């Protein structure tokens, strides 16, 4: 789906539309022998938030053979810790140190 | 008796997982393990293909 720069100036105040953002971290680059390019892409919009709150882990593919690809994250040491019950009621954590 | 709450076999949960695969990144090493080596750590491998 692609929107226009004229409609982004006339959209009603309380009507929330969705506008998708492209990734592109895992994309194989072109071969050595192929046609070149001429004066390319111009992007016109940018979020200032940032727009990524749900992550956990990203791009689970290896680079070369033994290292992380530039800009990839692993799961946090919190969703991987089953604690114990409280002294009486609910749930606890580690405890640390 | 009144019967307030009803019971279930397996719990659901509020927060679940999602994924977007890239259908061109396949490793050429079909690995293998035992059957109990499979079951416990089984469906979790097929959510992180």
């Amino acid at each position: 789906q692609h929107v226009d720069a004229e409609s982004i100036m006339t959209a009603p105040k309380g009507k929330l539309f969705h506008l998708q953002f492209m990734d592109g971290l895992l994309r194989p680059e072109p071969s050595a022998f192929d046609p070149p390019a001429s004066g390319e892409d111009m992007r016109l919009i940018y979020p200032l938030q940032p727009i990524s709150v749900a992550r956990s882990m990203r791009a689970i593919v290896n680079h070369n053979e033994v290292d992380r690809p530039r800009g990839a994250v692993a799961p946090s040491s919190y969703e991987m810790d089953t604690g114990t019950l409280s002294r009486n009621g609910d749930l606890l954590y580690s405890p640390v140190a | 008796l009144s019967d307030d709450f009803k019971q279930i076999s397996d719990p659901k949960g509020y927060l679940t997982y999602s994924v977007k695969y890239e259908d061109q990144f396949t490793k050429k090493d079909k690995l293998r393990a035992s059957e109990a080596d499979d079951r416990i750590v089984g469906p979790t491998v097929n959510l992180f293909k």
């Binding site: 290896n62 680079h63 070369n64 690809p69 | 061109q24 990144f25 050429k28």
Partner: peptide, 27 residues
């Protein structure tokens, strides 16, 4: 079963030309 015999074997060799794949490996 009746007469004791003797047989022979030779380890076989199998190879095809290196096939073409369309799936990429690393980033």
């Amino acid at each position: 079963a009746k007469i004791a015999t003797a047989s022979s074997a030779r380890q076989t060799d199998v190879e095809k030309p290196a096939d073409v794949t369309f799936t990429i490996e690393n980033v």
